Amino acid sequence: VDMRTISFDIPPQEVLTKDSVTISVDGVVYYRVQNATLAVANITNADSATRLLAQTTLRNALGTKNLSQILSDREEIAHHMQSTLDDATDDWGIKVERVEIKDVKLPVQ
Amino acid sequence: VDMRTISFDIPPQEVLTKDSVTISVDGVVYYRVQNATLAVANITNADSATRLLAQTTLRNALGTKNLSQILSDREEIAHHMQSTLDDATDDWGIKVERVEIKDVKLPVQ
């Protein structure tokens, strides 16, 4: 089991903002296995669980914010997601090291 | 000179909204040569002039609107741009037939 930092792109997630605007946002997660036994102990492997939880964390963070609250605070949303995702992955012995939010797309009807 | 409807994609234009949000918007223009002598009379050819004026019209329409005014009114901005671009192309004997605004991107810093 690789103990180096690992990164993935979160594939774009289309969801409604608090004020019902459709947005699609992509991002990037950097994490490392801090506890390799816990990383292999679960029914879901650790990389797959981190990827699925990253999608859920991003979707939830967006869904509680109005579009304006999302645009001005893109860095803070990342940092708070880094915390939420780090807590959610502790069961797999994963330390989330960094989350980045990239382009916000407002796709047409 | 082809008298059929012609279309092009407006390549994405990065500009500031009235309230200083960076957005990039692409779109599509459908036009037809209604007067073929006027279409070939100018120093700039008609297709190239329509493409350049479409970029200018889009950039200006966006730059006079706050982000919120742009998101809720995407169809109306197209229709008004169709009018503005149709006036601006009359010197080339062009009839603009339709303008469409597609995805709005908010690119990261």
UniProtKB/Swiss-Prot annotation, chains A, B:
Tissue expression remark: Expressed in all sensory neurons of the dorsal root ganglia. In the CNS, expressed in many neurons of the spinal cord, medulla and pons. Expressed only in scattered neurons in the cortex, hippocampus, thalamus and basal ganglia. In the cerebellum, expressed in all Purkinje cells (at protein level). Widely expressed with high levels in heart, liver, skeletal muscle and testis and low levels in lung, brain and spleen.
Effect of L16D: Does not abolish interaction with ASIC3, but abolishes regulation of ASIC3 channel activity
UniProt-annotated location(s): Cell membrane; Cytoplasm, Cytoskeleton; Membrane raft; Melanosome
Residues modified to Phosphoserine: S68
Domain of life (superkingdom): Eukaryota
Phenotypic consequence of T89W: Does not abolish interaction with ASIC3, but abolishes regulation of ASIC2 and ASIC3 channel activity
Family: Belongs to the band 7/mec-2 family.
Record note on quaternary structure: Interacts with LANCL1. Interacts with SLC2A1. Interacts with SLC4A1; this interaction positively regulates SLC4A1 activity. Identified in large complexes with SLC40A1, SLC14A1, SLC29A1 and AQP1. Homodimer and higher order homooligomers. The homodimer is banana-shaped. Interacts with ASIC1, ASIC2 and ASIC3. Interacts with STOML1; may redistribute STOM from the plasma membrane to late endosomes.
Function: Regulates ion channel activity and transmembrane ion transport. Regulates ASIC2 and ASIC3 channel activity.
Protein name: Stomatin
Gene symbol of the encoding locus: Stom
Covered range of the whole protein: 94 to 202 of 284
